[PDB]
Design a protein around this ligand. Sequence first.
Ligand SMILES: CO[C@@H]1O[C@H](CO)[C@@H](O[C@@H]2O[C@@H]3CO[C@](C)(C(=O)O)O[C@H]3[C@H](O)[C@@H]2NC(C)=O)[C@H](O)[C@H]1NC(C)=O
Length: 165
Amino acid sequence: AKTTQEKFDALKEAGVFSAYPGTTDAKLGQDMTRAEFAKVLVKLFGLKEIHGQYSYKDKNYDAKNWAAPFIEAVTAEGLMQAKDLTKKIFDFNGKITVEEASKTLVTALKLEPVKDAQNKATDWAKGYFEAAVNAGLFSKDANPKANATRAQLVEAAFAADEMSK
Ligand SMILES: CO[C@@H]1O[C@H](CO)[C@@H](O[C@@H]2O[C@@H]3CO[C@](C)(C(=O)O)O[C@H]3[C@H](O)[C@@H]2NC(C)=O)[C@H](O)[C@H]1NC(C)=O
Protein backbone atom coordinates (compact mmCIF):
# COMPACT_ATOMS: atom_id res chain seq x y z
CA ALA A 1 0.00 0.00 0.00
CA LYS A 2 2.14 2.93 -1.36
CA THR A 3 2.14 6.37 0.38
CA THR A 4 1.30 9.58 -1.61
CA GLN A 5 5.05 10.55 -1.59
CA GLU A 6 5.93 7.02 -2.94
CA LYS A 7 3.20 7.43 -5.65
CA PHE A 8 4.66 10.93 -6.49
CA ASP A 9 8.27 9.58 -6.67
CA ALA A 10 7.11 6.75 -9.04
CA LEU A 11 5.18 9.20 -11.33
CA LYS A 12 8.08 11.75 -11.20
CA GLU A 13 10.61 9.01 -12.22
CA ALA A 14 8.13 8.04 -15.04
CA GLY A 15 8.13 11.73 -16.22
CA VAL A 16 4.36 12.20 -15.45
CA PHE A 17 4.69 14.64 -12.45
CA SER A 18 7.24 17.47 -11.84
CA ALA A 19 8.41 19.06 -8.56
CA TYR A 20 6.62 22.37 -7.70
CA PRO A 21 7.77 25.06 -10.21
CA GLY A 22 11.20 26.58 -9.31
CA THR A 23 11.80 23.92 -6.56
CA THR A 24 12.82 20.22 -6.10
CA ASP A 25 9.93 19.87 -3.53
CA ALA A 26 6.85 17.63 -4.17
CA LYS A 27 4.75 20.31 -2.29
CA LEU A 28 1.85 17.76 -2.00
CA GLY A 29 -0.13 20.50 -0.11
CA GLN A 30 0.06 22.99 -3.05
CA ASP A 31 -2.41 23.44 -5.99
CA MET A 32 -1.75 22.92 -9.76
CA THR A 33 -2.59 25.10 -12.82
CA ARG A 34 -4.82 23.72 -15.63
CA ALA A 35 -1.67 24.16 -17.84
CA GLU A 36 0.45 21.90 -15.53
CA PHE A 37 -2.44 19.35 -15.29
CA ALA A 38 -2.79 19.32 -19.13
CA LYS A 39 0.93 18.23 -19.23
CA VAL A 40 0.27 15.52 -16.53
CA LEU A 41 -2.62 14.10 -18.72
CA VAL A 42 -0.38 14.08 -21.87
CA LYS A 43 2.43 12.22 -19.96
CA LEU A 44 -0.06 9.93 -18.06
CA PHE A 45 -1.93 8.72 -21.23
CA GLY A 46 1.01 9.16 -23.70
CA LEU A 47 -0.85 11.78 -25.81
CA LYS A 48 0.90 13.45 -28.82
CA GLU A 49 1.88 17.12 -28.16
CA ILE A 50 0.30 19.47 -30.79
CA HIS A 51 2.69 22.25 -32.00
CA GLY A 52 1.63 25.26 -34.15
CA GLN A 53 -2.10 25.16 -33.21
CA TYR A 54 -3.88 27.61 -30.80
CA SER A 55 -7.58 26.91 -29.93
CA TYR A 56 -7.90 29.61 -27.16
CA LYS A 57 -7.70 33.44 -26.94
CA ASP A 58 -6.40 33.67 -23.30
CA LYS A 59 -3.94 36.59 -22.82
CA ASN A 60 -0.41 35.12 -23.51
CA TYR A 61 -1.76 31.80 -24.95
CA ASP A 62 0.51 31.63 -28.06
CA ALA A 63 3.77 30.07 -29.45
CA LYS A 64 5.72 31.47 -26.40
CA ASN A 65 3.43 29.55 -23.93
CA TRP A 66 5.22 26.26 -22.92
CA ALA A 67 1.82 24.65 -22.07
CA ALA A 68 0.11 25.25 -25.50
CA PRO A 69 1.30 21.87 -26.99
CA PHE A 70 -0.13 20.00 -23.93
CA ILE A 71 -3.37 22.07 -23.75
CA GLU A 72 -3.90 21.51 -27.54
CA ALA A 73 -3.34 17.71 -27.04
CA VAL A 74 -5.93 17.34 -24.18
CA THR A 75 -8.31 19.61 -26.24
CA ALA A 76 -7.93 17.39 -29.39
CA GLU A 77 -8.43 14.28 -27.15
CA GLY A 78 -11.69 15.79 -25.70
CA LEU A 79 -10.35 15.68 -22.07
CA MET A 80 -10.46 19.50 -21.51
CA GLN A 81 -12.14 22.50 -23.25
CA ALA A 82 -12.73 26.26 -22.70
CA LYS A 83 -14.45 27.53 -19.51
CA ASP A 84 -16.00 30.18 -21.88
CA LEU A 85 -17.03 28.94 -25.41
CA THR A 86 -17.79 32.55 -26.60
CA LYS A 87 -14.44 34.20 -25.60
CA LYS A 88 -12.66 30.77 -26.05
CA ILE A 89 -10.92 31.07 -22.61
CA PHE A 90 -9.20 27.88 -21.28
CA ASP A 91 -7.97 29.72 -18.11
CA PHE A 92 -4.49 28.06 -18.38
CA ASN A 93 -3.20 29.74 -15.13
CA GLY A 94 -6.45 28.80 -13.26
CA LYS A 95 -5.94 26.06 -10.62
CA ILE A 96 -7.48 22.63 -11.60
CA THR A 97 -10.45 21.73 -9.33
CA VAL A 98 -11.29 18.19 -8.07
CA GLU A 99 -14.44 18.09 -10.31
CA GLU A 100 -12.43 19.34 -13.39
CA ALA A 101 -9.73 16.64 -12.76
CA SER A 102 -12.62 14.10 -12.33
CA LYS A 103 -14.06 14.94 -15.82
CA THR A 104 -10.59 14.55 -17.51
CA LEU A 105 -9.82 11.14 -15.87
CA VAL A 106 -13.41 9.73 -16.19
CA THR A 107 -13.31 10.76 -19.93
CA ALA A 108 -9.74 9.34 -20.42
CA LEU A 109 -10.67 6.01 -18.68
CA LYS A 110 -14.03 5.82 -20.63
CA LEU A 111 -15.92 5.56 -17.27
CA GLU A 112 -19.68 6.38 -17.58
CA PRO A 113 -20.81 9.57 -15.75
CA VAL A 114 -23.21 8.42 -12.95
CA LYS A 115 -26.98 8.91 -13.67
CA ASP A 116 -28.93 10.55 -10.75
CA ALA A 117 -25.54 11.73 -9.31
CA GLN A 118 -26.14 13.47 -5.93
CA ASN A 119 -23.11 15.32 -4.50
CA LYS A 120 -21.49 18.76 -3.87
CA ALA A 121 -20.29 19.14 -7.53
CA THR A 122 -21.23 22.02 -9.91
CA ASP A 123 -24.27 20.83 -11.99
CA TRP A 124 -22.18 20.09 -15.16
CA ALA A 125 -19.70 17.93 -13.13
CA LYS A 126 -22.00 15.87 -10.78
CA GLY A 127 -21.89 12.74 -13.05
CA TYR A 128 -18.09 13.00 -13.61
CA PHE A 129 -17.26 13.58 -9.89
CA GLU A 130 -19.56 10.70 -8.83
CA ALA A 131 -17.89 8.32 -11.37
CA ALA A 132 -14.40 9.45 -10.12
CA VAL A 133 -15.35 8.80 -6.43
CA ASN A 134 -16.96 5.40 -7.37
CA ALA A 135 -13.72 4.34 -9.23
CA GLY A 136 -11.56 5.47 -6.23
CA LEU A 137 -9.86 8.41 -8.07
CA PHE A 138 -10.90 10.82 -5.21
CA SER A 139 -12.11 10.14 -1.61
CA LYS A 140 -15.86 10.60 -0.79
CA ASP A 141 -14.95 13.67 1.39
CA ALA A 142 -13.12 15.57 -1.45
CA ASN A 143 -14.78 18.95 -2.20
CA PRO A 144 -15.42 18.78 -5.99
CA LYS A 145 -15.43 22.64 -6.28
CA ALA A 146 -12.07 22.94 -4.38
CA ASN A 147 -8.68 23.34 -6.11
CA ALA A 148 -7.18 19.79 -6.15
CA THR A 149 -3.98 19.45 -4.06
CA ARG A 150 -0.93 17.86 -5.74
CA ALA A 151 -1.53 15.01 -3.18
CA GLN A 152 -5.11 14.46 -4.53
CA LEU A 153 -3.87 14.69 -8.18
CA VAL A 154 -1.03 12.14 -7.45
CA GLU A 155 -3.58 9.71 -5.84
CA ALA A 156 -6.01 10.17 -8.82
CA ALA A 157 -3.22 9.88 -11.50
CA PHE A 158 -1.68 6.75 -9.83
CA ALA A 159 -5.20 5.14 -9.65
CA ALA A 160 -5.86 6.06 -13.36
CA ASP A 161 -2.40 4.70 -14.44
CA GLU A 162 -3.10 1.34 -12.65
CA MET A 163 -6.66 1.22 -14.18
CA SER A 164 -4.97 1.32 -17.68
CA LYS A 165 -1.67 -0.45 -16.64
C1 LIG B 1 -20.60 30.51 -15.36
O1 LIG B 1 -19.46 29.78 -14.86
C2 LIG B 1 -18.91 28.85 -15.82
O2 LIG B 1 -19.77 27.69 -15.91
C3 LIG B 1 -19.30 26.82 -16.97
C4 LIG B 1 -20.26 25.67 -17.32
O3 LIG B 1 -21.60 26.16 -17.49
C5 LIG B 1 -17.99 26.20 -16.55
O4 LIG B 1 -17.53 25.46 -17.67
C6 LIG B 1 -16.90 24.21 -17.39
O5 LIG B 1 -15.49 24.45 -17.40
C7 LIG B 1 -14.76 23.22 -17.14
C8 LIG B 1 -13.26 23.50 -17.08
O6 LIG B 1 -12.68 22.27 -16.72
C9 LIG B 1 -12.95 21.12 -17.60
C10 LIG B 1 -12.39 19.84 -16.96
C11 LIG B 1 -12.26 21.34 -18.92
O7 LIG B 1 -12.85 20.90 -19.93
O8 LIG B 1 -11.17 21.97 -18.90
O9 LIG B 1 -14.38 20.94 -17.85
C12 LIG B 1 -15.04 22.18 -18.21
C13 LIG B 1 -16.53 21.93 -18.32
O10 LIG B 1 -16.80 21.04 -19.42
C14 LIG B 1 -17.28 23.26 -18.50
N1 LIG B 1 -16.95 23.93 -19.78
C15 LIG B 1 -17.91 24.23 -20.67
C16 LIG B 1 -17.46 24.96 -21.92
O11 LIG B 1 -19.10 23.94 -20.53
C17 LIG B 1 -16.94 27.28 -16.22
O12 LIG B 1 -15.85 26.68 -15.50
C18 LIG B 1 -17.49 28.45 -15.38
N2 LIG B 1 -16.60 29.62 -15.54
C19 LIG B 1 -15.76 30.04 -14.58
C20 LIG B 1 -14.92 31.28 -14.94
O13 LIG B 1 -15.64 29.50 -13.48
